[PDB]
Design a protein around this ligand. Structure first.
Ligand SMILES: *O([C]1[C]([O])[C]([C]OP([O])(=O)OP(=O)([O-])O[C][C]2O[C]([N+]3=[C][C]=[C]C(C([N])=O)=[C]3)[C]([O])[C]2[O])O[C]1N1[C]=NC2=C1N=[C]N=C2[N])P([O])([O])=O
Lengths: 193, 364, 364
């Protein structure tokens, strides 16, 4: 299960999940165009998408438990990039012996986990930082790249599709980057050469 | 001299039965110092206009012979947009070319022209004036013609009765796709109130829900969900998790719908009833009164604003501002242009009969 | 040691199904300094007591093993008159022979004895004390045992919400034959309020109408008259002749009855719903809210008085004084004496089943 469901990472995790045949739940904030965002995430491989309101809901909990039982499996892993209530909700959805990895933190919000989960459900909460993990681990870095590469253009993985702007002398280089920073909300910005 | 046309009745009844068109003359060379002649640009058909003609609405213009009929006759329609075509010497508040609405109900807006006093009207900025004053948008004819009932109604119910804490508290309303409903959702977004809109189910529910959320509803549920024992706790969670409370219910349906929305309020809730879906009384469980300190009251914009020019002004000014700034949108009316090839009253009769198609605006 | 009996339940449900009698022991030798032991003289069956047992009344005693059961069990009854039989050495507020009621709800009054502190009780003057203090009357057991809920309810509804002009204004109430209805009629007479009581038709209608008029109802109508459009103008005549207005409606029935009494109010009226004697919801026509500015609210004496001990005391004192002065009489009860041959819970079960006959008081 993961929050920040529309994030770039979120979108890759949904795909990789599908390739590895891992079932997944993406949590996203509600919006007027919910149906379209939900469809896009399911196309990428999210098995189920829920809102944060649904994530907050004691009433909805049993519905998620049914999904997991039906697959003859268990929710073993939570990926948190939001914090606060959202981190609380995704943690609660794990079966016993679950792990949360926190790899980001949207705006001020601490990772907030019910005591009962740690004591009675053997829950563990840890961090993830790709840089630190791979600093002195080139064998692991390259092994993972080799698989991403193979899936790439075996045609099995789809990149997130960037808005590119050519450095072609039309504008100075830093102005290209300055615009992509100012234009982050439109999507991932790639400067090409 | 101006030849004008007015939709009248001499006896209450159904619009299909009792309306007729009267020609009459307005003397444009003989204005008293405070008099104003206006020419109608458009006027809508609202349920209250119909109920007034029917004789079941306790606010109505007097029947007089002033349009040149033998029998005393009443005019029709309570809101509309007019253009000022001439003013008397002591009129400083209006000029030829200005846009106005009636300052009071019972003016009679289903007609081509009218003679009144300057205090019979309220100035709205015309498009030219709005653009000259630096605003990004001028009002449309539909926006001016329909500004006086439904937008003021939504604004006042939401702000005049209980103070909803911005960012936290909730109102709930039925008739979610009604004109007032859609204004209230927008006002809730604008003022930062959370809201639940209750609507009827339909084949294109996905599209309507998205539309209402874009306008500003926080949540949209069907009437089946409003009635549902199973669904009830999900709503209580929305409110609880927000840190606010559901303090106000807006009711325009009555019956089971009114029951359902009442039950979704926290303790010390207030319901305002401002409309009904035909013969369906307001129905509230006894338990809400006794154990939850519920209160149900009424809202009638006509009565509230009758002797409150200050409140009417302040409210109207804000709605005008939002239209000029592009922060408020009207529902599109079905417009029928009067060109003299068909009697005016028949245009209004068709509009009444076709009310289910959508809001009817007669234009000129 | 005293061997007492308490009426208990371990699970919510109908009194006929869930009630039983538990024998328990109280130590009446060697009282703690602040402790007080009381014997019941009588306790009534009120609808609230029954709703508590049924589990549809959100204020109730905890289920505990404190009466010597293995399953957690709740006592029954919120109202009753008790005689003090022994007090501890640091108790001066109370002495042997004193009359008391519980100071708080959820005491459990359907039982023979209790042990608490002096703050668990409120002293009422006993007949001997009233006469010694120079009063022409003292309280009866029924009057003491029913003083705490229904008279305060009637008094507060009539005085605490809207001010009726003495000698002019009206209230209208349904459930006119209820104990609360009977106190309201008397309090109306004492404060010089005009009133209309609505009652169900019955074979002995004339006798009932006479009783209620003697109590203080100005007019008594049936529910059929309440429903009647034809009869409405007659009521309007009464009110017009008085010079006053119908400003307040008291509803303990719901459904059509609640509709009828609301319609009889003058504009800007208030209704208080304090009960729902059929399961029917409060039903109000949309037009009353919108066009007559009607307001519908709740009343719950338990909630009103929770943090309003001054208001409780003042109200109770007035009822006591009126009884001592001979100005108020009790809504009469059918008394059933407990004597040990039939289990206590069965007396109360019979009382619940005979509710329709009238107020029931189990005596001791
Ligand atoms: O008509 C019935 C009686 O008039 C009436 C019941 O009378 P009662 O003496 O047994 O009951 P009371 O103790 O007076 O009070 C009963 C109702 O008031 C509510 N209450 C009281 C005190 C405090 C609270 C509060 N909110 O603070 C509330 C209580 O919950 C009761 O609802 O009822 C009449 N009745 C019975 N069935 C009826 C009906 N009227 C209309 N329709 C139906 N079905 P009678 O005399 O028998 O003909």
């Amino acid at each position: 299960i993961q929050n920040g469901g529309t994030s770039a990472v979120g979108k890759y995790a949904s795909q990789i999940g599908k390739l590895l045949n891992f079932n997944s739940i993406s949590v996203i904030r509600d919006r007027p165009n919910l149906d379209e965002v939900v469809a896009s995430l399911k196309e990428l491989g999210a098995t189920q998408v829920i809102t944060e309101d649904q994530n907050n809901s004691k009433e909805f909990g049993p519905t998620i438990k049914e999904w997991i039982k039906q697959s003859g499996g268990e929710a073993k892993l939570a990926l948190n990039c939001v914090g606060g209530k959202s981190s609380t909700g995704i943690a609660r959805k794990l079966n016993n012996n679950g792990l949360m990895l926190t790899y980001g933190g949207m705006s001020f919000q601490p990772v907030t986990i019910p005591t009962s989960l740690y004591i009675f459900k053997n829950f563990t909460s840890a961090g993830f930082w790709v840089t630190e993990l791979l600093k002195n681990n080139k064998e692991l870095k390259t092994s993972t790249l080799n698989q991403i590469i193979a899936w790439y253009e075996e045609g099995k993985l789809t990149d997130a599709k960037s808005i590119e702007t050519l450095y072609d002398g039309t504008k100075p280089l830093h102005e290209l980057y300055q615009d992509g920073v100012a234009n982050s909300k439109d999507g991932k910005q790639l400067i090409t050469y | 001299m101006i030849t004008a046309q007015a939709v009248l009745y001499t006896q209450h009844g159904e619009p299909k039965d009792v309306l007729f068109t009267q020609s009459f003359e307005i003397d444009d060379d003989n204005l008293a110092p405070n008099e104003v002649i206006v020419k109608t640009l458009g006027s809508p058909v609202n349920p209250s206009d119909i109920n007034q003609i029917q004789g079941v609405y306790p606010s109505k213009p007097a029947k007089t012979t002033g349009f040149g009929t033998t029998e005393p006759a009443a005019p029709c329609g309570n809101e509309g947009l007019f253009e000022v075509i001439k003013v008397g010497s002591n009129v400083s508040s209006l000029e030829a070319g200005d846009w106005v609405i009636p300052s009071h109900v019972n003016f009679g807006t289903w007609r081509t022209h009218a003679l009144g006093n300057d205090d019979d009207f309220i100035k709205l900025p015309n498009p030219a004036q709005s653009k000259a004053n630096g605003k990004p948008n001028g009002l449309t004819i539909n926006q001016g013609a329909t500004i006086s009932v439904n937008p003021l109604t939504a604004y006042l119910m939401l702000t005049h009765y209980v103070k909803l804490t911005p960012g936290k508290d909730w109102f709930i309303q039925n008739g979610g796709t009604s004109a007032v409903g859609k204004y209230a959702s927008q006002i809730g977004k604008l003022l930062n109130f959370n809201s639940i809109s209750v609507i009827r189910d339909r084949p294109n529910l996905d599209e309507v829900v998205a539309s209402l959320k874009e306008l500003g509803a926080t949540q949209v549920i069907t009437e089946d969900q409003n009635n549902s024992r199973e669904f009830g706790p999900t709503i209580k969670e929305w409110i609880k998790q927000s840190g606010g409370e559901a303090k106000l219910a807006l009711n325009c349906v009555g019956g089971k719908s009114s029951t359902g929305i009442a039950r979704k309020l926290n303790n010390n809730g207030l319901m305002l009833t401002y409309g009904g879906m035909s013969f369906q009384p307001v129905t509230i469980p006894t338990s809400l009164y006794i154990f939850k300190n519920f209160t149900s009251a009424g809202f009638w914009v006509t009565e509230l604003l009758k002797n409150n020019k200050e409140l009417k002004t302040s409210t109207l000014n804000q709605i005008i501002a939002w239209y000029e700034e592009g922060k408020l949108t009207d529902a599109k009316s079905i417009e029928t242009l009067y060109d003299g090839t068909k009697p005016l009253h028949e245009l209004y009769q068709d509009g009444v009969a076709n009310s289910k198609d959508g809001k009817q605006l007669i234009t000129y």
